[PDB]
C-alpha cells in the first residue's frame, strides 16, 4: 500500500502502542508508530462521471472526462473524532517514556513541501487522492461527530519521486467510495533548542521505505553453514 | 524440524543432522534469470560441499572418523563440557580460528 | 586420545543477503501475482527453543529489494500501453459551471 | 533446568500388573535418554532398563526380561514403566532418571551418567 | 561388569580426608560416575568421566583413576558429608552400581 503521513490496511500490535526510531534523541529521524487497534476513515468522490473515448490513431483510444451529471461537489475523508481522541492519547502516553512525566506535548501540522508529502496521499478504486490533515494533527496536551478532511484530485501522476517518466490516470466512471484502517503514522520532531520545555511533532513521509520497514521489521535471513568438527574418541578403522 | 536443535546441546544435535541435510538442495526474463541463479548457486555449494568430503576420505556419510588427533592447543574443553554444555553455535565461534589448519591437516592425512 | 571427527548437518548459521522469490495464493494486476509460486495452505514455522538472536530493523536488505521490486513491476506494467504524445498541445480553456460549489469553484475546467 | 515428575505410591496384589509414569520439563524428549532404577528397602540400586526415544529399541536386564515394558510418548513427553507378575520381594522405591547422550557415528552412542533424578515412588505388594 | 567399593563403612573426624576405591572386573576406559545420597532423599551426582566434577558441587570433592581402578577423595569433611556413596559404570549395557560406602561423621 502506498500511502503518505498514515499507514493503511496494515498490521496492529499485539499489547500496546509501539514508538521506534533509530535514534530516538536525533531528530533528523522518523518515529514510526504502530497502533493497538486501527482507526476506520471513510473516503469518497461523490461526483457521477462519464467517460469518452476519442480515436487518436490505428488502434488507440484516449479517456476522456465527458459531462458530470448532477450537482458538482469535493471529494472528502471522513474519520471519527472520539476514536481518534483515544489513539491520540495512548500515542503521548507512550511518547512520554522517551522525554519526560511533566513535558508538553503538541500536534501540528505539516511545514513546507510539495503536494505529495505535505498531504495524505492515496489511491482510492483507480484515483488518487490528495487529503489535507490539518484536522487531524492539531492539539496540545498537558501532564457521533467526525473529522471531515477536504482532498483533491489529480491525473498526471509522478510516482517513487521520479522525474522524466509520467502517467496519465484514465478516469473512473460512477460514485466513488473507499473504507480503510489506519493502522500507524509517520512522524519528525522538530529541533526546539534553548531550554525548550515543550515538543512539537509533524507527520512526515515522502520515502516508501519507511512503509515497507514496518511490515518487515521482524524477520531476518540467515545462511546455514552444515560442517563441522569435533573430538571424538572413534578412530578410522 | 529444520534447525530444531539450535538451542540444544552438541550431543542432542548429533542425531538429527539429516534434517539440515535434505533442507539445501531443494527444501519477465528480468525475475526468471535472477531465480536461476539461486538455484544454480546452491547446486555449485552444495557439490563444493560434497568434494570436500570426498577428498577427506568421507564420501557419502553423515558422521565421518578420521586418523588426526586433536592437537589439546585447539581446545582444551574436555568431553563431557563439550557434548552435554555446549551448543554447536558457541563451538564455531571458539574454534573459527583453528578450522582452515585442521582442514589442511585432514587433506594431507587422507591423500598420505 | 582424541581424533577429528566430521559431522556434515549442523546447525550453524550466518548473517547473509541473498535473493528471496515471491509467492501469492491461488487477472490483470500490476504486480504481476499470477507469475509467482502458489503458496502452501499450511505453513511450518518451527520455534527454536532456547535461542537468542539480534535483530536489527533499521539495517535490514529485505526493504531494499521490495522496494526495487516494486518498482520494477510498475515499470512493467506500463509498456504495452498507449503514449499520448498528441496530447501536448494547446487547450482553449474555460470555468465550469452549471451547478458547482462555493468549495469547488475553479477546480475544473472545460478545455477543447 | 531440567525436573522429572512421577506419580504417586502404589499398592497391587500378587500376579497383577503395575504401570508407573515419568513427565520430564526441560529438555528435548526424542534425543534424551531416560532410565528406570529401582532400590529395596534396606538394600542398594539396581538398574532396571533404560533407552533413547529416537532408537526406539530398550535395553533391560536379564533378571527382569520378560517382565518388564518401557514405553514412551512424545506427545505428552512421558514415560511409561510396566512390570507385570510382580512378586513378594518387588515391593520397593522406583526412580526416573535422565542423562544426555551423543553419537560418533555408525549406530555407537556415548552416555554420561544420571545427571537428573525424580523423586521416587513407592510400589507395595501384600494381601 | 562388576564393581567392588572398599571400604564399607568409614567414620572420621570434621577437617580429614578420606578415600573410597572402586574396582571393575575389567576395563571400563574412563566411564565412571560417583553418586551421593542422604537418607529420605534421591541420589544426588558428584563425579562423571571419573574425574570430571559437576556444577554445583563443592571442590572438595575429588575424582581419579582408570583403567580398573578408580579412587574418590574428600579433603575437607564437613557435618553434611555424612551419606551413602556409591560408583557406577555406564561404559556397556547393563549398568551396575556398586555397593556403596556410609560414610560417618566422628565429633
Known amino acids: 500500500v502506498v500511502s503518505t503521513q498514515l499507514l493503511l490496511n496494515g498490521s496492529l500490535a499485539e499489547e500496546e502502542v509501539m514508538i521506534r526510531s533509530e535514534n530516538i534523541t536525533n531528530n533528523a529521524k522518523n518515529i514510526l508508530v504502530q497502533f493497538n487497534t486501527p482507526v476506520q476513515i471513510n473516503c469518497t468522490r461523490p461526483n457521477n462521471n462519464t467517460r469518452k473515448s476519442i480515436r487518436i490513431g490505428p488502434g488507440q483510444a484516449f479517456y476522456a472526462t465527458g459531462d458530470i451529471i448532477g450537482d458538482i461537489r469535493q471529494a472528502h475523508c471522513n474519520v471519527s473524532k472520539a476514536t481518534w481522541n483515544e489513539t491520540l492519547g495512548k500515542v503521548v502516553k507512550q511518547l512520554r517514556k522517551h522525554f519526560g512525566n511533566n513535558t508538553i506535548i503538541r500536534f501540528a501540522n505539516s511545514s513546507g513541501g510539495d503536494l505529495e508529502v505535505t498531504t495524505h496521499s492515496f489511491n482510492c478504486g483507480g484515483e488518487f487522492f490528495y487529503c489535507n490533515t490539518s484536522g487531524l494533527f492539531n492539539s496540545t496536551w498537558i501532564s457521533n461527530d467526525s473529522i471531515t478532511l477536504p482532498c483533491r484530485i489529480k491525473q498526471i501522476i509522478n510516482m517513487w519521486q521520479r522525474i522524466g517518466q509520467a502517467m496519465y490516470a484514465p478516469p473512473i466512471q460512477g460514485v466513488i467510495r473507499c473504507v480503510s484502517n489506519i493502522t500507524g503514522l509517520i512522524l519528525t520532531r522538530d529541533g526546539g533548542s534553548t531550554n525548550s520545555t515543550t515538543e512539537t511533532f509533524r507527520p512526515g513521509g515522502g520515502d516508501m521505505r519507511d512503509n515497507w520497514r514496518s511490515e518487515l521489521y521482524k524477520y531476518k535471513v540467515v545462511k546455514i553453514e552444515p560442517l563441522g568438527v569435533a573430538p571424538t574418541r572413534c578412530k578410522r578403522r | 524440524g529444520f534447525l530444531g536443535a539450535a538451542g540444544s546441546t552438541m550431543g542432542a544435535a548429533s542425531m538429527t543432522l539429516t534434517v539440515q541435510a535434505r533442507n539445501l538442495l531443494s527444501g519477465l526474463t528480468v525475475w526468471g534469470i535472477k531465480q536461476l541463479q539461486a538455484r544454480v548457486l546452491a547446486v555449485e555449494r552444495y557439490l563444493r560441499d560434497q568434494q570436500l568430503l570426498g577428498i577427506w576420505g568421507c564420501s557419502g556419510k553423515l558422521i565421518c572418523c578420521t586418523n588426526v588427533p586433536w592437537n589439546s592447543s585447539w581446545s582444551n574443553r574436555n568431553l563431557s563440557e563439550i557434548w552435554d554444555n555446549m551448543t554447536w553455535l558457541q563451538w564455531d565461534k571458539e574454534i573459527s580460528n583453528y578450522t582452515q589448519i585442521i582442514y589442511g591437516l585432514l587433506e594431507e592425512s587422507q591423500n598420505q | 586420545n582424541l581424533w577429528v571427527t566430521v559431522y556434515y548437518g549442523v546447525p550453524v548459521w550466518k548473517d547473509a543477503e541473498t535473493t528471496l522469490f515471491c509467492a501469492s495464493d491461488a487477472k490483470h494486476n500490476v504486480w504481476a501475482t499470477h507469475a509467482c509460486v502458489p503458496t502452501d495452505p499450511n505453513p511450518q514455522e518451527i520455534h527454536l527453543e532456547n535461542v537468542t538472536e539480534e535483530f536489527n530493523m533499521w539495517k535490514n536488505n529485505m526493504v531494499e529489494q521490495m522496494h526495487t521490486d516494486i518498482i520494477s513491476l510498475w515499470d512493467q506494467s506500463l509498456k504495452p500501453c498507449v503514449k499520448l504524445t498528441p496530447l501536448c498541445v494547446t487547450l482553449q480553456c474555460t470555468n465550469v459551471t452549471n451547478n458547482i460549489t462555493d468549495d469547488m469553484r475553479g477546480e475544473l475546467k472545460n478545455c477543447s | 533446568e531440567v525436573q522429572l515428575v512421577q506419580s504417586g505410591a502404589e499398592l497391587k496384589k500378587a500376579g497383577s500388573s503395575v504401570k508407573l509414569s515419568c513427565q520430564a520439563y526441560?529438555?528435548?524428549?526424542?534425543?534424551?535418554?531416560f532410565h528406570w532404577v529401582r532400590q529395596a528397602p534396606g538394600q542398594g540400586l539396581e538398574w532396571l532398563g533404560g533407552?533413547?526415544?529416537?532408537?526406539?529399541?530398550?535395553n533391560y536386564t536379564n533378571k527382569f526380561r520378560g517382565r518388564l515394558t518401557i514405553t514412551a510418548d512424545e506427545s505428552a513427553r512421558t514415560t511409561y514403566m510396566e512390570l507385570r507378575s510382580l512378586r513378594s520381594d518387588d515391593t520397593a522405591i522406583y526412580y526416573c532418571?535422565?542423562?544426555?547422550?551423543?553419537?560418533?557415528?555408525?549406530?555407537?552412542?556415548?552416555?554420561?551418567?544420571?545427571?537428573?533424578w525424580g523423586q521416587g515412588s513407592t510400589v507395595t505388594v501384600s494381601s | 561388569i562388576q564393581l567392588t567399593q572398599s571400604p564399607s563403612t568409614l567414620s572420621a573426624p570434621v577437617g580429614a580426608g578420606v578415600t573410597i576405591t572402586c574396582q571393575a572386573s575389567?576395563?571400563?576406559?574412563?566411564?565412571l560416575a560417583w553418586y551421593q545420597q542422604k537418607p529420605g532423599r534421591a541420589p544426588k551426582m558428584l563425579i562423571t568421566?571419573?574425574?570430571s566434577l559437576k556444577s554445583g558441587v563443592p571442590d572438595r570433592f575429588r575424582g581419579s583413576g582408570s583403567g580398573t581402578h578408580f579412587i574418590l577423595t574428600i579433603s575437607d569433611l564437613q557435618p553434611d558429608d555424612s551419606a551413602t556413596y556409591f560408583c557406577?559404570?555406564?561404559?556397556?549395557?547393563?549398568?551396575?552400581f556398586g555397593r556403596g560406602t556410609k560414610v560417618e561423621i566422628k565429633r
Open positions: 557406577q559404570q555406564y561404559n556397556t549395557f547393563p549398568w551396575t
Open positions: 575389567q576395563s571400563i576406559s574412563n566411564g
Open positions: 526441560g529438555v528435548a524428549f526424542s534425543t534424551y535418554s
Open positions: 533407552f533413547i526415544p529416537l532408537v526406539g529399541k530398550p
Open positions: 568421566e571419573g574425574s
Open positions: 532418571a535422565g542423562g544426555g547422550a551423543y553419537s560418533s557415528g555408525g549406530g555407537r552412542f556415548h552416555y554420561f551418567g544420571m545427571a537428573v
